[PDB]
Homo-oligomer: A and B are copies of this chain.
Amino acid sequence: MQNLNVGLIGGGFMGKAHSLAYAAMPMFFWPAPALPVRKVIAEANPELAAEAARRFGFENSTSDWRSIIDDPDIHVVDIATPNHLHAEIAIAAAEAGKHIICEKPLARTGEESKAMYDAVKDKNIVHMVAFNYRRTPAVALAKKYIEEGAIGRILSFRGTYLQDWSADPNSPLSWRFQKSIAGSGALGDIATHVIDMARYLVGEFSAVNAVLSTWIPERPLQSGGARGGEGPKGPVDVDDEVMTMIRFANGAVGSVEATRNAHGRNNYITFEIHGTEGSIVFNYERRDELQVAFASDQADRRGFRTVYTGPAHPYGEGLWPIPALGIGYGETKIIEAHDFFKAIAEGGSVSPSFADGYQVALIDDAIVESAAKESWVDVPQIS
């Protein structure tokens, strides 16, 4: 069992979720495909980097991410920066022969995402984009039901990602509100999670037809850096909200809606799927649960079942002794890391890859063009 040395670049507060995954994955899944080692962490300056290494349990620290890419003893690069730095870092890591996990969206733009995909697609490396929510056991359970034929053929998909964290106009202008850094707003940040689920559970997209909305068009800068610390107001040039209708390649239909401006909605990732022989509903705010209705039930006892994920369900062998002992965000990252390291050790590939990341970027570009032209747009299809 090989030690694989991880370099984490950035990650913000949420670096805890990355370093949790690397520390806990072999505890959960044993024998492990390989032993992750928290070898080096990069942050914006050496003091921050040193402190993060202390907090997150990394052996070494640096303010120079290139030093990680050029260290022949780093096996894995974890890219957890904002969207504008993914491509440079990933392409450099791909050329140095490193396995890569990258945060979503894959990049700021479709063209930038293509360059990342092109850099990895022919190398002998494992590449993964962090659509971690598809590894919620309930979501993998939905996939299991679908693949088995348990709900028949899929006709219709509804997926949402509703949030309220920026719904106060005094919430400051950060990079997530700046097209030049993020590329898009709700679309890239939260709709991509839902789009990944649609691709996973339903299939590829054929065409989209969308509307983008910006509800809080100006926000205060933070004068003291990234109430009473306001600087000047600046404009928000990204979407707060996206809705899109979808025609799937396989003839199903659907729709995706995401917003940052839904008071009472925290991390409300949902889908509802209607098949010819049943339906499946999911709500990440209650992520331990999957709801499923089978048409085959006797007429006097039909309806949605609330199924709690546990040992009987996908990834159960790595998780808790009983259903509802409690899945949080961390378990999705632990499962993600397990599958990532399994691909590395077995010389194979993982889903979702940079291929998937790039297909989502192509869907995003189509949504933006559709919204601008007020018309259906076809989505080019990589696979």
Contacts and interface: CB of A to CB of B under 8 A. Distances in A.
User: How many copies of the chain does the oligomer comprise?
Assistant: 4
A304 to B, nearest CB: 5
A294 B30 CA distance: 33
B213 A155 contact: yes
A23 B23 contact: yes
* Chain A, interface SS category: mixed
B310 A266 contact: yes
A13 B321 contact: yes
Contact of A263 (B32, B278, B306): B278
Contacts of A263: 151, 274-275, 277-279, 293-295
A322 interface: yes
A286 interface: yes
B267 A255 contact: no
Contact of A301 (B55, B145, B243): B145
Interface stretch (A14-22, A93-101, A103-111, A348-356): A14-22
A243 B245 CA distance: 8
B302 A264 contact: yes
A359 interface: no
Contact of A307 (B303, B321, B329): B303
Contacts of A26: 55, 57
Interface in A247-288: 247, 253, 255, 257, 259, 261-268, 272, 274-279, 281, 284-288
23 contacts: A20-B23, A20-B27, A23-B24, A163-B322, A165-B322, A168-B295, A209-B245, A215-B276, A243-B255, A262-B272, A262-B279, A266-B324, A267-B323, A267-B325, A284-B326, A285-B289, A302-B307, A303-B306, A303-B307, A320-B329, A325-B329, A328-B330, A328-B331
Interface of A: 13-16, 19-20, 23-24, 26-28, 30-32, 55-57, 141, 144-145, 150-151, 155-156, 158, 162-163, 165, 167-168, 209, 211, 213, 215, 241, 243, 245, 247, 253, 255, 257, 259, 261-268, 272, 274-279, 281, 284-289, 291-295, 297, 299-308, 310, 312-313, 320-332, 374-376
